Amino acid sequence: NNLDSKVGGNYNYLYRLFRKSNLKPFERDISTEIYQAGSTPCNGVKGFN
Amino acid sequence: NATRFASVYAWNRKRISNCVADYSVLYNSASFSTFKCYGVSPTKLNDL
Numbered sequence A: 001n002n003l004d005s006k007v008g009g010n011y012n013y014l015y016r017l018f019r020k021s022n023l024k025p026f027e028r029d030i031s032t033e034i035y036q037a038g039s040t041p042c043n044g045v046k047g048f049n
Numbered sequence B: 001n002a003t004r005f006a007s008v009y010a011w012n013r014k015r016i017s018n019c020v021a022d023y024s025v026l027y028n029s030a031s032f033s034t035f036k037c038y039g040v041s042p043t044k045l046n047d048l
């Protein structure tokens, strides 16, 4: 916190909130392609669900 | 789908038990402009 956080905040530190499946041990996923959580297809940067 | 809502100073609150909570009929509707969670995720609610 004392080295790594910042007063208005630090925000460089992404985690991942979604994935079609669990990953395998020591897998690394760099893909940022939009997660189609709903029944609709979803090209473009966002959508509902 | 009720007509009138309470204020934020006197916020309403309903106890829920003795039911099955189908989120599919709720969450899979674009009528919501916000839906954001803090210990759970929409893709797993019905398994909880």
Ligand SMILES: *[C@@H]1O[C@H](CO)[C@@H](O)[C@H](O)[C@H]1NC(C)=O
Residues within 6 Å of the ligand: A021, A022, A023, A024, A027
């Ligand atoms: C690997 O990619 C394929 C095709 O997209 C997919 O079916 C599979 O689930 C992926 N596996 C992992 C561990 O990401």
